[PDB]
Design a binder for this molecule. Structure first.
Ligand SMILES: CCCCCCCCCCCCO[C@H]1O[C@H](CO)[C@@H](O[C@H]2O[C@H](CO)[C@@H](O)[C@H](O)[C@H]2O)[C@H](O)[C@H]1O
Ligand SMILES: CCCCCCCCCCCCO[C@H]1O[C@H](CO)[C@@H](O[C@H]2O[C@H](CO)[C@@H](O)[C@H](O)[C@H]2O)[C@H](O)[C@H]1O
Lengths: 262, 252
């Protein structure tokens, strides 16, 4: 998409050399924001082939708050493989917190259910928020989630959402993030009888890995095609009751896929 | 500032009416300030670095009672008190019932691992915010170091453009300067990111007044002294130079 390519180009034009924790090099910039008017079409990247199938399972899996990579491997989803251990446990890199923010008093807070009510009963609340950033638990932990904060907002019957990522690989994860947020907004809006507004995507450390230069140049050589449209073929009883089969993407004509290197 | 004015204009132009008190509002904004281009104190109305310095300093002590904020005459946050903000920066409670000093945490990270992609302070403790009533409006921030330059991004879930935002920008930039000093880094950018970004309908007159003024050159922040720690700054360590704003605008 136009915005997306502009970001790649901006990283190339003005990104700074910065290493990650492995010592592996990137071109990085800090602070970025883009907006996708979801009435204009579902923001699935067209300049490389992406797979809605992967976005759906990933999102249904976050929604369950499953902590084991199993379900993701059944359905051929691998973006989280790096952070999985020996027995496929993802540490804190998952969505348990969304549904079961533990509080020391033997208690658990279901954040998703809370936004759901807020959108129906107080759509103007300035704090319709989900956070996975549980400092108390993340403290002495090797890993940490990266898309750990989102906010909803309602104006004129339309539902909008903003996702903050502290770390974003422009080539690898950003397209997943965008479609995943967009998908949730459609599901949220269906459940709450709202129409869809904007999806706003906000970054901290936004970066391209140095060894993805070839992939990036190829993708920047290609013209974005018209956005597809998401079709939901069932209305489930609750946000947690969706199935892979409910979704279809229409009018998706992408450029060929570009594999990530070794 | 040109960017502040653009946002103010934008909310006037494209803000949705809400309401009981009314607002115009938009969702999602981001603006950037290169701190080497000057200290981003708003000039289209006079602000007082005095009140910003005290406010930030108080946040860093992680004090909950607004005792210090009256002895040094800082009104703002009054309407959110009877006491209330910053206790989570310094003392986020663990299951185990210890506490986590996030400010110390990010301080060590900046000194020992500036590359880190998780140099984050959060005030959004969901477990304590189930108590509705009030909630911090500046949920979290992230620091970032590249090429010996320290940037920071502040996220406001709710922002009053007229009253609150100019304060927010100055405070964040001031914090970047202080940490840059404690970690021996140059200052990079301060990035301001918003969720619900609104103007109150009872601030229109003031808003039109401010949009009618052209910006002036940004001042320069002076730090007179280097304390031993980020908790060791006092109000008198800071000066502002070449600050030449339009007259201040009081809001009702
Ligand atoms: C709106 C609701 C849905 C939210 C969308 C969520 C879908 C996310 C899509 C792809 C997810 C993977 O992407 C993301 O995961 C990693 C772990 O958190 C991040 O990795 C980051 O955190 C890890 C810590 O455990 C570190 O080892 C990495 O060096 C660091 O960069 C990646 O930098 C980021 O690309
Ligand atoms: C990185 C260092 C800087 C960190 C702090 C930055 C400066 C803070 C001073 C700004 C003054 C107040 O700003 C902010 O206060 C209120 C509560 O937090 C917010 O108020 C918000 O939350 C309240 C309580 O949950 C609600 O009653 C309001 O509906 C909601 O708008 C204001 O919308 C916002 O304007």
């Amino acid at each position: 998409m136009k915005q997306y390519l502009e970001l790649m180009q901006k990283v190339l034009d003005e990104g700074t050399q910065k290493n990650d924790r492995t010592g592996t090099g990137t071109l990085s910039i800090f602070g970025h924001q883009m907006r996708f008017n979801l009435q204009d079409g579902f923001p699935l990247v067209t300049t490389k082939r992406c797979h809605l199938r992967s976005i759906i399972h990933l999102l249904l899996w976050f929604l369950q708050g499953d902590t084991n990579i199993a379900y993701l491997h059944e359905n051929n989803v691998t973006i989280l493989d790096e952070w999985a251990d020996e027995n496929g446990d993802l540490g804190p890199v998952h969505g348990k917190q969304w549904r079961a923010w533990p509080t020391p008093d033997g208690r658990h807070i279901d954040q998703i259910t809370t936004v759901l009510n807020q959108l129906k009963n107080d759509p103007d609340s300035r704090r319709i928020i989900v956070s996975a950033w549980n400092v108390g638990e993340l403290d002495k932990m090797a890993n940490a989630p990266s898309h750990a904060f989102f906010q909803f907002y309602v104006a004129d019957g339309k539902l909008s959402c903003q996702l903050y990522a502290r770390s974003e690989d422009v080539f690898l994860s950003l397209p997943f993030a965008i479609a995943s947020g967009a998908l949730l907004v459609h599901m949220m809006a269906q459940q709450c009888d709202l129409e869809v507004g904007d999806f706003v995507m906000t970054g901290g450390d936004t970066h391209l890995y140095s060894n993805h230069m070839d992939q990036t140049h190829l993708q920047l050589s290609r013209e974005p095609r018209p956005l597809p449209k998401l079709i939901i073929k069932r209305k489930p009883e609750s946000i947690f009751d969706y199935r892979f089969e409910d979704f279809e993407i229409e009018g998706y004509d992408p450029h060929p896929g570009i594999k990530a290197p070794v």
